[PDB]
Amino acid sequence: VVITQSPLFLPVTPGEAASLSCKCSHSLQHSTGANYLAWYLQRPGQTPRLLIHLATHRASGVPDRFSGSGSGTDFTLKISRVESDDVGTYYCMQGLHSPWTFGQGTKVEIKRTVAAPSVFIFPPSDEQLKSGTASVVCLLNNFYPREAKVQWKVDNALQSGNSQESVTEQDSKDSTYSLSSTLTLSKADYEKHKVYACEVTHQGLSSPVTKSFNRGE
Amino acid sequence: QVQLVQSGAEVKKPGSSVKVSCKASGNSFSNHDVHWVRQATGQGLEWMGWMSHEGDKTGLAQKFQGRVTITRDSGASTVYMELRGLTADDTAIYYCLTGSKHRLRDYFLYNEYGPNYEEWGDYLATLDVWGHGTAVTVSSASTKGPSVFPLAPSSKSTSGGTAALGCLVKDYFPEPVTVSWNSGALTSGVHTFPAVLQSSGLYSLSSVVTVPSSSLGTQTYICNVNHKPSNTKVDKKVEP
Numbered sequence: 001v002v003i004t005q006s007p008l009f010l011p012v013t014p015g016e017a018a019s020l021s022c023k024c025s026h027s028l029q030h031s032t033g034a035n036y037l038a039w040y041l042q043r044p045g046q047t048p049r050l051l052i053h054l055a056t057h058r059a060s061g062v063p064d065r066f067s068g069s070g071s072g073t074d075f076t077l078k079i080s081r082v083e084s085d086d087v088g089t090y091y092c093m094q095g096l097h098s099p100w101t102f103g104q105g106t107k108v109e110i111k112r113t114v115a116a117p118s119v120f121i122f123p124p125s126d127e128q129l130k131s132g133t134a135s136v137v138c139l140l141n142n143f144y145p146r147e148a149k150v151q152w153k154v155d156n157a158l159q160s161g162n163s164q165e166s167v168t169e170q171d172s173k174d175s176t177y178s179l180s181s182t183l184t185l186s187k188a189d190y191e192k193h194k195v196y197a198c199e200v201t202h203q204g205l206s207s208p209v210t211k212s213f214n215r216g217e
Numbered sequence: 218q219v220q221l222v223q224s225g226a227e228v229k230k231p232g233s234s235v236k237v238s239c240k241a242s243g244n245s246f247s248n249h250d251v252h253w254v255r256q257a258t259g260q261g262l263e264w265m266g267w268m269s270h271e272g273d274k275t276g277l278a279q280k281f282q283g284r285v286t287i288t289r290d291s292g293a294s295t296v297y298m299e300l301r302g303l304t305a306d307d308t309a310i311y312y313c314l315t316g317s318k319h320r321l322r323d324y325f326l327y328n329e330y331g332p333n334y335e336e337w338g339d340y341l342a343t344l345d346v347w348g349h350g351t352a353v354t355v356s357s358a359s360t361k362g363p364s365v366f367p368l369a370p371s372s373k374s375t376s377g378g379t380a381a382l383g384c385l386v387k388d389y390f391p392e393p394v395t396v397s398w399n400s401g402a403l404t405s406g407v408h409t410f411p412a413v414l415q416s417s418g419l420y421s422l423s424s425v426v427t428v429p430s431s432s433l434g435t436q437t438y439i440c441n442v443n444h445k446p447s448n449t450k451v452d453k454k455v456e457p
Contacts, residue, residue, distance in 0.1 A: 131364070
């Protein structure tokens with residue numbers, strides 16, 4: 001018994017309609033006629049909210065812009081006039097075949113115009129250096145779409161295996177993302193080099209952007 | 218509006234076992250089915266198992282067959298889920314929940330000479346009330362409060378009348394950590410990033426904020442970091 005949700009990722013222009021597919025390898029219709037398929041929305045930071053149950057019924061307090069349909073194997077969730085409160089992951093869940101199972105989810109976000117990140121770089125603090133470690137931090141602020149690439153250079157040498165990054169959730173007001181990347185070195189390695197640089201690639205940038213500083217000044 | 222209360226966050230070594238508990242206001246597990254669902258950071262919902270409120274049916278996902286026990290005390294006052302043989306893959310938030318089912322007669326054969334032949338099945342209609350969850354972290358790491366370092370605003374973090382500044386919250390265990398700026402007074406333009414898990418088994422995160430360049434000479438910026446697991450409370454002033 002397998003469930004496939006489609007699409008995996010869905011950008012939606014505010015006010016436009018959205019259509020989500022949930023398909024099952026086996027029928028979800030009981031012989032009494034009911035289809036045991038439910039839709040759930042999970043917003044960032046929240047537990048899932050039931051939207052639709054028994055395939056076609058809105059749950060209590062669910063706005064009428066959400067509607068479910070389908071019978072047998074193929075099911076649809078339509079969202080008309082999508083807004084920032086609708087952003088999150090939508091899971092279908094089949095309740096006919098034991099053991100019951102969630103789909104893998106469709107991620108819905110607000111579509112907006114392209115926005116290149118503003119890029120900021122932060123040297124390690126004197127206090128951190130005292131303790132024998134150097135973390136350099138790169139911030140990519142307010143960009144869209146979510147895909148961005150950061151490449152750390154040390155005296156122009158490409159770094160790998162010594163950095164980690166983290167991205168925020170979509171901002172509800174401007175529909176952007178922000179990302180931070182942290183390069184970590186020992187004090188010893190850090191003091192053997194001069195130029196520390198964060199090189200950034202994004203759909204909004206015609207060519208890569210480098211933010212750098214020189215150790216000391 | 219039943220409320221579910223779950224047991225507190227736990228850290229467990231790979232190879233051990235956790236027993237999570239759940240209570241429902243008004244002893245509602247007597248009258249409403251219990252479900253267990255887990256979710257790892259950044260990943261999907263995973264149904265674990267359930268027990269009918271009648272107490273006559275229990276089931277598990279295929280993946281938890283031989284791994285999980287779902288039980289309840291008499292009078293259904295507390296419900297428990299035990300997961301054994303933990304690995305890093307079991308690091309997740311574990312949710313307790315109520316649900317509704319349809320208990321339906323699937324098989325019926327008329328018997329003229331005594332009681333009928335019947336078979337009944339349970340079908341899941343809704344998941345209803347979700348608990349707040351129990352964070353289980355599978356790791357051999359030791360509890361550790363973060364170091365907090367300033368991300369100082371400079372000419373390399375300033376342009377077009379706006380500057381960025383932040384705090385780096387380095388090397389803590391376990392999750393969670395909370396960050397505010399100027400005791401909650403500063404919220405506009407704050408980005409507090411999800412933690413990353415480092416090779417050492419410790420977490421790190423950063424919080425940044427964009428502010429008017431103008432204000433760097435006059436406005437004070439302090440990040441407030443709270444790591445309850447280690448009772449660590451740090452206020453760090455961030456200077457130019």
